[PDB]
Amino acid sequence: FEPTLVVQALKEAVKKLNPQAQWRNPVMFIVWIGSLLTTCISIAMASGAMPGNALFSAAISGWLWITVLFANFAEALAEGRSKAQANSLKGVKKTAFARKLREPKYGAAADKVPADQLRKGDIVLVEAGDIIPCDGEVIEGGASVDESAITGEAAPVIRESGGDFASVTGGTRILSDWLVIECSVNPGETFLDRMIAMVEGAQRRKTPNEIALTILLIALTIVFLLATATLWPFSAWGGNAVSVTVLVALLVCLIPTTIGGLLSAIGVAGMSRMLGANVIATSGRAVEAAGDVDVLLLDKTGTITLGNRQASEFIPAQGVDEKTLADAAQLASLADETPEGRSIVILAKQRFNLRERDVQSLHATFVPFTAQSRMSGINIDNRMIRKGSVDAIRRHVEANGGHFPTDVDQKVDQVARQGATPLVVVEGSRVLGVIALKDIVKGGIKERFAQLRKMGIKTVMITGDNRLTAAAIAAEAGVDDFLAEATPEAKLALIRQYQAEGRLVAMTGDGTNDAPALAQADVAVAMNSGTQAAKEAGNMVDLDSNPTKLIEVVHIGKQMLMTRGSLTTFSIANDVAKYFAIIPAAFAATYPQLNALNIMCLHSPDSAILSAVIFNALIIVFLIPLALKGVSYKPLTASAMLRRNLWIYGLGGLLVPFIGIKVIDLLLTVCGLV
Amino acid sequence: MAAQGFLLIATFLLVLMVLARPLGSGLARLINDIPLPGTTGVERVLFRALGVSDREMNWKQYLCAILGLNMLGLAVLFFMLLGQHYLPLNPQQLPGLSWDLALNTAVSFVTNTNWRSYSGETTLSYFSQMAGLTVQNFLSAASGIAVIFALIRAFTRQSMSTLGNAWVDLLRITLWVLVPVALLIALFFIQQGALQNFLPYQAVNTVEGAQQLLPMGPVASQEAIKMLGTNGGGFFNANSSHPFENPTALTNFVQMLAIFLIPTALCFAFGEVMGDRRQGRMLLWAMSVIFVICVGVVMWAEVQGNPHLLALGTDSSINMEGKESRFGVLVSSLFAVVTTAASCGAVIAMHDSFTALGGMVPMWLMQIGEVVFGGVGSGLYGMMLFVLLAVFIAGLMIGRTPEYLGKKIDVREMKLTALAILVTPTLVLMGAALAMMTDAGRSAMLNPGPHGFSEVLYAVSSAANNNGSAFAGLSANSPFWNCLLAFCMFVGRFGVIIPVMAIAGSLVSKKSQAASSGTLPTHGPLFVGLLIGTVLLVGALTFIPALALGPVAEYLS
């Protein structure tokens, strides 16, 4: 709403005021043709052959032109903000320079170029520190990239020449290696550019719901065009006919011009606001599908795991003490630099203030976490202390000439009853014990799932564990339906099961393994860390790589729909008060008897209609902030949200026009224009 | 008084509900296509003999069956009225209705309107009444109920493409529902004092030298069916106030119960068929709250009445100008709101002479779309168009996509709903404009000024909503009014019936998802609120301009 974008959308409105560009909004088109008709009547009055009082019809036609200009302005402003958001996302890519090689082989003098001018035939170098400016193919050498822009988990990946890693994207951040690529004009590796070009042009697909709402507004416009136009025969029978200017004013005022004008601004505002939430929509259809999703398959990992499981119970293999058990578990886990080992050591210190170990116990050989041994430990004593999984520890004690006592396995079965994946510690060749590591929910998610449950969106977990631990975690999180040993085809089967009932399905899945489900899904937030084959499945594309973001995409969906409905009611209701401002002050010369309906005590007929029209235009420009920042809403239950939006905007549409029209009339009288 | 008006309303509604729940289950059994308890042998032999069979109909064929039947009814009726001087049962040799009046009466009675510009006792012989008007009363009401049966089956079916066959529904509605209950109400009136005979007009030498010529005819049969089927076309001119059509206060009460018997029974049957009765109750609560507030307004306006009567010298300002005397103002007022709310169209107190405000409310309940307990069948499906509108708005301000009874509502229902809702405002307003411009149109008033225009607006408003009521001063016998009102009634009824069936055809190909925990109940005080709100707001917004120059301007006069 800042000056620059305001003036630019104002000039856009004036340039979109011509008729050939508003066929496509019959409510605004009736306001436009009305405005034209009354300016013609005004000119005729001002110098020519008509009854008289040129001003009042010129002032009515001027304010109707302002109403058209404000509708065009609201839409231009929404689109301007959308373009700003799109160009800012592309400007995340435009923050990068580009080093172009003179000779294609690695090692040469390169010049820095902004990351947009690289075209077909160029051979560019990207070394450690810079951002990859543009796409292309790797021809020589090998680097590790972080895909930071096209991947929000920062996991590294090696990119070598002469292999399957010759597909290079643009905007990401490079690591401490180097890469020689050839810029190409093949299809890119970003789904950003695609929508960026989509919305930047002059096109927008009406969404089903916004076609239904337009069908409603058009029915309202026909009903009121017929009423206000058939006022002319009735009046003309009863006395001196109603003017044509007062009738065009009554027609424009009644017509739902508020939601009429703002409809398109609301659509593009919802898209821009989601874009602000970092997800790249594909079309309004997908946003309103988001608004309708009755189930979202949030996979456990990502949001309900909160990193990795941490210890919960101490289980001794030798009846050992919990203090010495936690001391030996942390001692052995110091060599496990993964988050799991750090969490085990932290929970040990926290549980029994076993905090530090001096250097004298040090001068050891640390066993790092390894895939081949599947065990970590410390060889402080002449025996080897170890820590690993249950299967690898059983296989290594059987390989290390030891044995696992039966009580250890029985307690492991107890941990299996608990639903926690058991970790085992072994000292030398005799097992020391098992520690139960139950995974935590995100901590602040049961409430959001409760709110969704209220709105009517049954969360659904999808995990790879068994149907006992999965139920445990389900109840732990506040989800409804849970799957064990989640296999992609089974995920697709569940998706079609939930679609058959009519319910839409929401989903977050990276990687081609979930591609068919995503395509089958209705709102598929393909995470921006996965393969381009998965992003292209589409219907949504994230950028923060937060699978919880789907929740926000549903808030934005229902915000957009709530805005449409709420303003619709606001406009229909609004007409009730415009009747009391116009009817008794349009017929105050034909039927004197009708002054008693002038309840607002408006000053004079002429002032009454000029004031109703002025309030019509000022409502369309006062409600922009709301039609662009969406209708704030807390997730109350469906009936109570109906009751809140009927109270707020039903009495918006009765009590606000009274104050509106009477204040504009009051202002006009004071200034002395009537 | 009004202490003893509210009793009248309470007893009327209570008795209407007691009588309606049973018959509501009756029509539930018909909608489900299950033989009404005793008639399966008869249904079978009869359908086999006729040619109707088990084969069902998709929306196109159902619609075309009902429209073929109605249009054929129109052809035979227009030809009866246009040649009744060649048919028997002429007690007084009467001429064949002219072309314009024939067309108007025919189109009126085929489309359940029963508008009446003629004078039944001097213009129609018996044969036309007995086997013209009454037969088309039966078939217009059976068509209305066959269309609401198609709609309700559309809501309660899933993934089918057939709305059950139209000839079976017409035969079961007529033979089982209407003929018995109408033969019973007709024996009741023939006791109370109505007349049911074919004697020639009987002479009368009054106790004074003067002399009069009582009419006669088959009046009680046509009464039972003109009420029960919410028609209005009674035999005589002052149809339901003539002491030969509605003789004592008790038959007046049976006629109000009959005017609402089938619309309310249909609401309860609709509640049943869906398995969740609360939908039916929801509908009745909306329609009842509107009707009760309306009857409050009217009873009050009348009991205030014409103040000139109190100044001019009379004894109480009560407005007994039009009203009958066997009925008070309380019962005549309740019968004006009942007759015009339900699209029955049987006036019991000439609606012209109601105090301005007293006449706005019936006139308004007609212009609203004949929603509140509307005509046989027309009530429910017109109400349901407003319910789809309200469901749409609610779904739109909940985030959900619109839903009613589990079936989504996409644009193909929205277009059809907007058109069906449009069909009657557009007719009444365009018609009122045409009448008030053409000279013939506005040379058929009786009262001048505001109320003079009110007569024209109410005549067109009744006709295009299929009401049949009329301000009765408006001389609607001139060929202009016949053709205008004929076209209005025709397009009113059939223009609503075609989109309703398109809606049913498009709602039978869906699948009704279950009721999740986040779908707004369509049953309860807040949705009945939002339904009343949608109906009243749309009606008021459309018609307060037209009504500000008719009744209101007269009231404030």
Partner: peptide, 27 residues
């Protein structure tokens, strides 16, 4: 009827034609 009234009737019918046309389309 008269110049003004015929132009008015024609224009209202034109706008109703355009509106119903929009109500029967997705524009």
């Amino acid at each position: 009827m008269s110049a003004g009234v015929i132009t008015g009737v024609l224009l209202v019918f034109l706008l109703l034609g355009y509106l119903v046309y929009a109500l029967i389309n997705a524009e």
